């Protein structure tokens, strides 16, 4: 360690060895978590009140979606000390299969990424969480395909 | 209790805005302070410096017609130095590959677009986040469509 | 005219429109920046000083018809550091633009796919960042700010 | 303290330029003596035809500048159509005008030039066609008074 550098910061990436779950990690190469940011239950805990930049990306992969009725979601939520209800700050939905379902052929690997980012005023003790409804379609194979992070502006 | 900061803005789509994109600031988890004004659906930069501009839109439709809709989303800039609307960020997305479902109707599709970048803005510059088809907006749930700038 | 000085390492490079089958990054164009020490060498950004940076890039893919079998669109920002001289992926995304529908006696139709990547990272002096795509033949830089790549020292 | 029992018609629109739109051409409909009714919708500064049929398209713009410091300035005004059958911008009506033919106000100034441009024609439009009236130099617009810049269609 040479130069100090500061601000609450976090850039966590999904655990590749979790398969059917999205577990956030910080001890893996180009990942960061320092200066007060806590990771409790896959939740980032704000250490100080101020303006933050919140972002997250998720990559979905399925092997030839046979079901027209497929819905993929990705949302970053906030539970604050002032108002103790989970509300979505950033949200996105994506329909991966436009009915087109493989009939007389073989599998069709589809990939769908979703990216979210925004600036918010957060308070001390706020709990941020990035979650998806289909954690069985997670593709954490490669490296920077799924992540979640904040930086104090 | 905690002191303010720097020019910032995070505006959200109006949920009760019938088929149109009106940006709002006086709603939960939204900001517009430290000089940034929202004029006629436009953000006005109050001071010279480097800003980070971003916006997301969620498009939803209840079926794939034959028209072949093209979804566009661009953040453009009108500067005091060059009084022409020029695009800073843009993206295009075609939602329908389907050969118009003739028996399996409805089937709601969802398509998002996210834009973000760093730019140098001048005093009085007007940024505008716009889309070509404001009739496919999904401003139903919170924070699905938004637009913001922050002075870095 | 002159108002405020401004500072910190920043870069926002945009693809060259007069380039064919290539993603060549340019800095000497209207709303593009490359100042405060950031160097653009071999289609690569060279970090001039250690700190926390914000990295982002967008790519727009377009084709006028659906091709055969499955084509995969890739977009990754990589980093080769002085500390570890091997290129590792910081951000990645894959996207399938053509879902079956291999045109066999049917009309072609232009598809568009954007891909965006962004995150905060700690970079050192002399690190070489590069944003690249696997199929530079589907690039749609026919309009402005549709493909770009940038960093800013926070 | 009055009464009204007035009827209606067929797709029509007559929109007027925004006066408080700094150096830009924003089309408005919620202003006196302006129309946008019977299905014609205004999206992204574009009119969307609500039904297929025979239409009359017209538009005027007024250009004003406060001096001629360039014998090489071009003012153009075009009504273009991007159609559902052919998703390409094609010109329906166009006109070009050179506002400054002289050798620039080299001595005294305050010579405001005014040059108007008018377009009109009948066309066959389909449902979902998007019509757009545009100019090349939106910095010379004279929207100071009323009914100086306008754009409209009417279903014949």
């Amino acid at each position: 360690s040479r130069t100090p550098s500061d601000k609450p910061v976090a850039h966590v990436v999904a655990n590749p060895q979790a398969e059917g779950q999205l577990q956030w990690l910080n001890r893996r190469a180009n990942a960061l978590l320092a200066n007060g940011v806590e990771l409790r239950d896959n939740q980032l805990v704000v250490p100080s009140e101020g303006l933050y930049l919140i972002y997250s990306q998720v990559l979905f992969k399925g092997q030839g979606c046979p079901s027209t009725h497929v819905l993929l979601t990705h949302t970053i939520s906030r539970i604050a000390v002032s108002y103790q209800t989970k509300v979505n700050l950033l949200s996105a939905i994506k329909s991966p299969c436009q009915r087109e379902t493989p009939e007389g052929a073989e599998a069709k690997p589809w990939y769908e990424p979703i990216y979210l980012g925004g600036v918010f005023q957060l308070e001390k003790g706020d709990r941020l969480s990035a979650e998806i409804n289909r954690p069985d379609y997670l593709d954490f194979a490669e490296s920077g395909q799924v992540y979640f992070g904040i930086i104090a502006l | 209790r905690t002191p303010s900061d720097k020019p910032v803005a995070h505006v959200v789509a109006n949920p009760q805005a019938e088929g149109q994109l009106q940006w709002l600031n006086r709603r939960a988890n939204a900001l517009l302070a430290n000089g940034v004004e929202l004029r006629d659906n436009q953000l006005v930069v109050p001071s010279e410096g480097l800003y980070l501009i971003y916006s997301q839109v969620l498009f939803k439709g209840q079926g794939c017609p034959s028209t072949h809709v093209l979804l566009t989303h661009t953040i453009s800039r009108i500067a005091v130095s060059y009084q022409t609307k020029v695009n800073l960020l843009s993206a295009i997305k075609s939602p329908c590959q389907r050969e118009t479902p003739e028996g399996a109707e409805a089937k709601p599709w969802y398509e998002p677009i996210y834009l973000g970048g760093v730019f140098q803005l001048e005093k009085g510059d007007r940024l505008s986040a716009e889309i070509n088809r404001p009739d496919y907006l999904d401003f139903a749930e919170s924070g699905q469509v938004y637009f913001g700038i922050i002075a870095l | 005219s002159s108002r405020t000085p401004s500072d910190k390492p920043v870069a926002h490079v945009v693809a060259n429109p007069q380039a064919e089958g290539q993603l060549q990054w340019l800095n000497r164009r209207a709303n593009a920046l490359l100042a405060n020490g950031v160097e653009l060498r071999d289609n690569q950004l060279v970090v001039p000083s250690e700190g926390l940076y914000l990295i982002y890039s967008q790519v727009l893919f377009k084709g006028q018809g659906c091709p055969s079998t499955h084509v995969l669109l890739t977009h990754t920002i990589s980093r080769i550091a002085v500390s570890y001289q091997t290129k590792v992926n910081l951000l990645s995304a894959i996207k399938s633009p053509c879902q079956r529908e291999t045109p066999e006696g049917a009309e072609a139709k232009p598809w568009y796919e954007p891909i965006y990547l962004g995150g905060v990272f700690q970079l050192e002096k002399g690190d070489r960042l590069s944003a690249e795509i696997n199929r530079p033949d589907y690039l749609d830089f026919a309009e402005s700010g549709q493909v770009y790549f940038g960093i800013i020292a926070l | 303290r009055s009464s009204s029992r007035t009827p209606s018609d067929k797709p029509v629109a007559h929109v007027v330029a925004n006066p408080q739109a700094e150096g830009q051409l924003q089309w408005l409909n919620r202003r006196a003596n302006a129309l946008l009714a019977n299905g014609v919708e205004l999206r992204d500064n574009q009119l969307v035809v609500p039904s297929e049929g025979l239409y009359l398209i017209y538009s005027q713009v007024l250009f004003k500048g406060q001096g001629c410091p360039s014998t090489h300035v071009l003012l153009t005004h075009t009504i273009s159509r991007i159609a559902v059958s052919y998703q390409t911008k094609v010109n329906l009506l166009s006109a070009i005008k050179s506002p400054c033919q002289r050798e620039t106000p080299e001595g005294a100034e305050a010579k405001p030039w005014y040059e108007p441009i008018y377009l009109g024609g009948v066309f066959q439009l389909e449902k979902g066609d998007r019509l757009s009236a545009e100019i090349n130099r939106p910095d010379y617009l004279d929207f100071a008074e009323s009914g100086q810049v306008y754009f409209g269609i009417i279903a014949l």
Binding site: - | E37, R39 | - | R1, S2, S4, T6, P7, S8, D9, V12, N29, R30, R31, A32, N33, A34, L35, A37, N38
Partner: protein
Amino acid sequence: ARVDQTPQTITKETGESLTINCVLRDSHCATSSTYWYRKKSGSTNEESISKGGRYVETVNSGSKSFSLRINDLTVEDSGTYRCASECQYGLAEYDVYGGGTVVTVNA
């Protein structure tokens, strides 16, 4: 015309009450869909004045007039207040505005 603000320039002291009158001249605009907007002196953030508390709105349908009483004037209640109305006849529906400046001096 198209709505006429009567008190054009007023100058009152902190702790008082000014009334602004607007009169309809278009027989298609209604005294029912009336709106108010304020612009604080030296700032172009024209906001929508809310009808309640210190801001009381009186409507009289007979004379086609609406007014806006502002109570407890402060030194920050100095600006330019405009009134608005929604008009509708046949296939046309539009709105109209006025103009008039307020300056409050503090004691």
